[PDB]
């Protein structure tokens, strides 16, 4: 009984969180009303990891929906699986955050955080043995970014020895809502450096490029981007949600993926990624070749520009476990220059018999690569282009912040960039 507590915060966080529970609920055979209707016991073996068992054999997600405005969560409550969530687990305000990190972290958000912690504390007091938490949110807005990282700071204070995991959508000027997203993202990153054990970095530009160039979607929508996040979130959590010889909990994964405390930002990937030639069978070599291809990576970072500290690959479906080992060893033994040679056997593989909905097999990629410094360099450059002229700062100083806090965020992330640079050589 190693329970996980899910928190989704803000527009992006709740919309991506929604699809996530939609994808895995289908995998575990849970219908929109919470009733199970699968045909395999493997669907229920680890069901309590993400679901609470209610009366009448009902399964209720262990999720907390947080936002500073009602809109998005009214959408979820009316969405496909909206009825599946615990009504008391909706915590929201009316003011909004106006895409303002200071509003989510210092003013509007501070007024609502205690009530969110009351629901978090409630879900935890009922866990037989809590592994830790996972948060879905964007860093470019105000609620998921500012209040999300405030939540993390207070959860680490009340649960200092629990694992804190996040799926963090990183802003991109090509898929942007406001010009202040680099401000909000730079401020959040430092919070994550300090108070998360693992952060899956999801770049909206990588999601966009994949939808446009690979999936051949002329005009991607946030919905299309969220399908990729859904599938990816389902992939990285397969080991947690299904039985297998791995027997891995959050702290075991972190212990083998994070050689240095601050360098815990991961590049996720997924394969296959096919446009609608969609019924073709995908061989293990093809699966492996794509999984390691940069075009299948969602951090919009070229791995060949850095080096992998650790890699974790999860294969789903009935396939040749012998044939997997061969192709995995083939990728390593054919590109060993991109793996640090001072971490022996830093590429691990795990299999799972149950494939995602509508796929004979698939592979999810989880990489701790120094190339992720390119992502933080982009953000840092966009931050500095505005901060050097103090552009748009009045939105933040009006909430009680000072320029000094911005200069420190700037320096905190340029230190992070440098830390990745030393381990790349």
């Amino acid at each position: 009984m190693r329970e996980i507590v899910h928190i989704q915060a803000g527009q992006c966080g709740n919309q991506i969180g929604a699809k996530f529970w939609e994808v895995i609920s289908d995998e575990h055979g849970i219908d929109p009303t919470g009733s199970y209707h699968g045909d395999s016991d493997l669907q229920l073996e680890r069901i309590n990891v993400y679901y609470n068992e209610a009366t009448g054999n009902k399964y209720v997600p262990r999720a907390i929906l947080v936002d500073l405005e009602p809109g998005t969560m009214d959408s979820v409550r009316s969405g496909p699986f909206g009825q599946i969530f615990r009504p008391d687990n909706f915590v929201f305000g009316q003011s909004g955050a106006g895409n303002n990190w200071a509003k989510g972290h210092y003013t509007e958000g501070a007024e609502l955080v205690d009530s969110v912690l009351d629901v978090v504390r409630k879900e935890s007091e009922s866990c037989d043995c809590l592994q830790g938490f996972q948060l879905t949110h964007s860093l470019g807005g105000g609620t998921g970014s500012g209040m999300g990282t405030l939540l993390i700071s207070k959860i680490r204070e009340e649960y200092p020895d629990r694992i804190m995991n996040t799926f963090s959508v990183m802003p991109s000027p090509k898929v942007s809502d406001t010009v202040v997203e680099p401000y909000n993202a730079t401020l959040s990153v430092h919070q994550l450096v300090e108070n998360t054990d693992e952060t899956y970095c999801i770049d909206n530009e990588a999601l966009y490029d994949i939808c446009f160039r690979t999936l051949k979607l002329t005009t991607p929508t946030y919905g299309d981007l969220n399908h990729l996040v859904s599938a990816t979130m389902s992939g990285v959590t397969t080991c947690l949600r299904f039985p297998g010889q791995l027997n891995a909990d959050l702290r075991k994964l972190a212990v083998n993926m994070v050689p240095f405390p601050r360098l815990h930002f991961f590049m996720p990937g997924f394969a296959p990624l096919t446009s609608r030639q969609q019924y073709r069978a995908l061989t293990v070599p093809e699966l492996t070749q794509q999984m390691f291809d940069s075009k299948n990576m969602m951090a919009a970072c070229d791995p060949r520009h850095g080096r992998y500290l650790t890699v974790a690959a999860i294969f789903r479906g009935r396939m040749s476990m012998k044939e997997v080992d061969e192709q995995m060893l083939n990728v390593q033994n054919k590109n060993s220059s991109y793996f640090v040679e001072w971490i022996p056997n830093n590429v691990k593989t795990a299999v799972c018999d149950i494939p995602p909905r509508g796929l004979k097999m698939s592979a999810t990629f989880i990489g701790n690569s120094t190339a992720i410094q390119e992502l933080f360099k982009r953000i840092s450059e966009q931050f500095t282009a505005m901060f050097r002229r103090k552009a748009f700062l009045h939105w933040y100083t009006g909430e009680g912040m000072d320029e000094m806090e911005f200069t420190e965020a700037e320096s905190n992330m340029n230190d992070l960039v440098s830390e990745y640079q030393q381990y790349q050589d």
Partner: protein
């Protein structure tokens, strides 16, 4: 795509093999400390055999046979011959040798003197030669007092063996020489002899009444090119190859290189390598070995061949680097890692 690592930058041989390997576009060189390799061109001393063959999915190959030092060390070779029944102490192709430890440190001091006093009493030729592995340091003398006293001044194990007082001399010149044979043993323990040998000749007339001047007695390529005044006079670089040497044996001695010399050389090579096969074979091992050997032979005026020593990290003659190194890639490397003749070797069949 195959991968290899280079851990011996001083090896002129495998510097060429590495060059050839990359020229195939199917071999990729890695940093010298990367464990994920197919082929290791390892160091000479303290090669970590224990770390080989433990990478999942990689067939790993190394260019040194673990345990071959027993054959390529002066004292070790003597001990191996005198203790191994396959060679026995009555081995007819190895000069009467003795292992002598300096008195500042088993040892064959009294056994040597017993045979020495016997030779001195029987009017026989009693000239011995003292040498060691720590040399560039050699002494030739007919008095047992000079040989022993020379070893005590040192601090490493030495070997005293019978000096061939009747060596075969080439004409014109009246000069001594030795024969270098290159032997390649692959992972399956096939023994291949390079068809091309080299004679390292002395450009000075052999003088039996003066072992003090070691320029006409030592045929080392470095001694002739530094202390001899007739270097490069009779043949380029004091190196006579088989084609020339065979034609000489026919005009002068009315015999061939195959009959008069090569049969004894091929016999000695088999006897040495077969002797230690059970000790160094990698047949059922988690990794695979192959090694290039350089045998040094002597020929006396009776056309009898003697073994001088075995070199575990030999060099090649400049003219033979291309043919030999290519041959190494063919039978030793591509035989295990194939790529996408008239062999230059002479396979010495044997029973495994």
């Amino acid at each position: 795509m195959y991968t290899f690592v280079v851990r011996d930058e001083n090896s002129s041989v495998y510097a060429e093999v590495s060059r050839l390997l990359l020229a195939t576009g199917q071999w990729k060189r890695l940093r010298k400390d990367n464990p994920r390799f197919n082929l290791m061109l390892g160091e000479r001393n303290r090669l970590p055999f224990g770390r080989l063959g433990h990478e999942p999915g990689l067939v790993q190959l190394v260019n040194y046979y673990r345990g071959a030092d027993k054959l390529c060390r002066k004292a070790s070779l003597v001990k191996l011959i005198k203790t191994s029944p396959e060679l026995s102490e009555s081995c007819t192709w190895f000069p009467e040798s003795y292992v002598i430890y300096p008195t500042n440190l088993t040892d064959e001091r009294e056994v040597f003197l017993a045979a020495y006093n016997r030779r001195r009493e029987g009017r026989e030729g009693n000239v011995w030669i003292a040498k060691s592995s720590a040399g560039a340091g050699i002494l030739i003398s007919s008095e047992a007092s000079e040989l022993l006293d020379f070893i005590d001044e040192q601090g490493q194990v030495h070997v005293i063996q019978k000096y061939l007082e009747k060596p075969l001399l080439l004409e014109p010149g009246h000069r001594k020489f030795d024969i270098r044979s290159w032997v390649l043993v692959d992972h399956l323990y096939n023994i291949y002899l390079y068809r091309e040998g080299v004679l390292r000749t002395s450009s000075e007339p052999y003088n039996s009444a003066n072992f003090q001047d070691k320029t006409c007695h030592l045929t080392n390529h470095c001694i002739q090119k530094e202390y001899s005044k007739n270097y490069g006079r009779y043949e380029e670089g004091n190196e006579m190859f088989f084609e020339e040497f065979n034609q000489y044996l026919m005009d002068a001695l009315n015999t061939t290189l195959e009959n008069s010399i090569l049969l004894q050389i091929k016999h000695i090579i088999r006897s040495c390598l077969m002797c230690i096969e059970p000790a160094i074979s990698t047949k059922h091992l988690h990794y695979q070995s192959f090694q290039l050997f350089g045998f040094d032979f002597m020929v006396d005026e009776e056309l009898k061949v003697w073994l001088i020593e075995v070199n575990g990290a030999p060099a090649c003659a400049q003219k033979l680097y291309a043919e030999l190194c290519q041959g190494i890639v063919d039978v030793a490397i591509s035989s295990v890692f194939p790529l996408a003749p008239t062999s230059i070797f002479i396979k010495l069949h044997h029973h495994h």
